[PDB]
Amino acid sequence: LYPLVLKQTIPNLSEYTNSASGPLEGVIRRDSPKFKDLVPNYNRDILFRDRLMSKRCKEKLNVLAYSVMNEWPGIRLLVTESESLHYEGRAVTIATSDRDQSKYGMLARLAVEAGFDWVSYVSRRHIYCSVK
């Protein structure tokens, strides 16, 4: 299970395609009839730099949270942001609590393992993940 490298994507294909996170949809606003569906994540072992996410997002973000702690006992997952799926709650921008950029490739792999539908090593600063 190799870590991802800068700009690597698993699966190795486009985000909005089928085998990945599936299609885009409605941009969710405060007035939106959708707005009631975006759930908060009050997992205490996830650090937020925001708490409001889609349903599948939470499911996988929680497995990854405890997967990070699993891979590195004492470390915590950090969510830094919750035209892409961010306005829909279906995308996260993540790092680790100890800010170890050298772990990011590994974190990316852990987001895949944790069952995110599409992971993208977008920068040295942070990893992008999304769900269908």
Binding site: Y2, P3, V5, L6, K7, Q8, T9, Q101, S102
Partner: protein, 214 residues
Amino acid sequence: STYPPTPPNVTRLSDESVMLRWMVPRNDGLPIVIFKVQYRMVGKRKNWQTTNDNIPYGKPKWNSELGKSFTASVTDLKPQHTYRFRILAVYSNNDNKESNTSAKFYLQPGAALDPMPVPELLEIEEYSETAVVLHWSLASDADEHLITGYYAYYRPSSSAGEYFKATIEGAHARSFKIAPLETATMYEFKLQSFSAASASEFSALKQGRTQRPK
């Protein structure tokens, strides 16, 4: 600390593929476990593409007084487009570091380019327990001024994996030691001549075994 690969140098293999060559300079930083290969189109809306291969660092640590050099192909490229290429090293701590990018490389169609000489590959010299020596010839006609060197492709016999590649420079070479190889192991080998602009059809695929420990 972690020392990056040099930017890859590119030669054209066919209308849809290229060979990349790079080095890791001698350094006391962390060991590299694998390299990943990335390319991107120069132009519209364009992102970095990662190929599926995980190129192993292999042994030994260094194959020269300067570092260790590597050869790898990128295939399934769209013809008649400009690309840039880079190499990413994965270190023993699972971090990664990318090379500087190559120069813009236009992928030529083959119509204007001259056929390269096909090497005639001779039986594999079963040199040692850990090495083999390839020998070949060039047809009488061959314009040797066209040739920069030869690319060798080899893998365990019957393996479904991608061929390992190695580069031998010099039109006048007619032999090449492939090493270190696994002991008592059947490999299959093919060879092509190359220049910057193209590369020959392949020699016959030849099988050869490293020696069995007595």
